[PDB]
Design a protein around this ligand. Structure first.
Ligand SMILES: CC(=O)Nc1ccc(CN2CCOCC2)cc1
Ligand SMILES: [Cl-]
Length: 115
């Protein structure tokens, strides 16, 4: 059901390697809705190629636009399983410290802080 359950470790490693070859300036990001989530919709896809210069604040704005949220819908985003310490960090720096061993950066979103 989740991305890690659908694709083998070997398969995830090879897809990150192909994104390095074909989209060298992009961060490979997995974005999934929290399994408990009621309010927010699901995304149109799972795997996202994020320009490596954007910061976490801008990525949140990007995901809010993709979900077509309105101003008063709450949105919380975990990176590698935990809260972001700072939204100002360039995603290239976030990737180097928070990437999975498969080479993806994993994110989860919910309408509540308590996931
Ligand atoms: C596109 C891409 O990133 N490819 C890739 C392929 C293999 C590795 C693993 N290497 C093998 C040779 O040296 C030891 C570690 C890393 C990256
Ligand atoms: Cl690129």
């Amino acid at each position: 059901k989740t991305f890690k359950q659908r694709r083998t470790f070997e398969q995830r490693v090879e897809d990150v390697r192909l994104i390095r070859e074909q989209h060298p300036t992009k961060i490979p990001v997995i974005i999934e809705r929290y399994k408990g989530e009621k309010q927010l919709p699901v995304l149109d896809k799972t795997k996202f190629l994020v320009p490596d210069h954007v910061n976490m604040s801008e990525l949140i704005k990007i995901i809010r636009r993709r979900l077509q949220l309105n101003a008063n819908q709450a949105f919380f985003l975990l990176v590698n399983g935990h809260s972001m310490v700072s939204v100002s960090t360039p995603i290239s720096e976030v990737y180097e410290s928070e990437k999975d061993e498969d080479g993806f950066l994993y994110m989860v979103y919910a309408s509540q802080e308590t996931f």
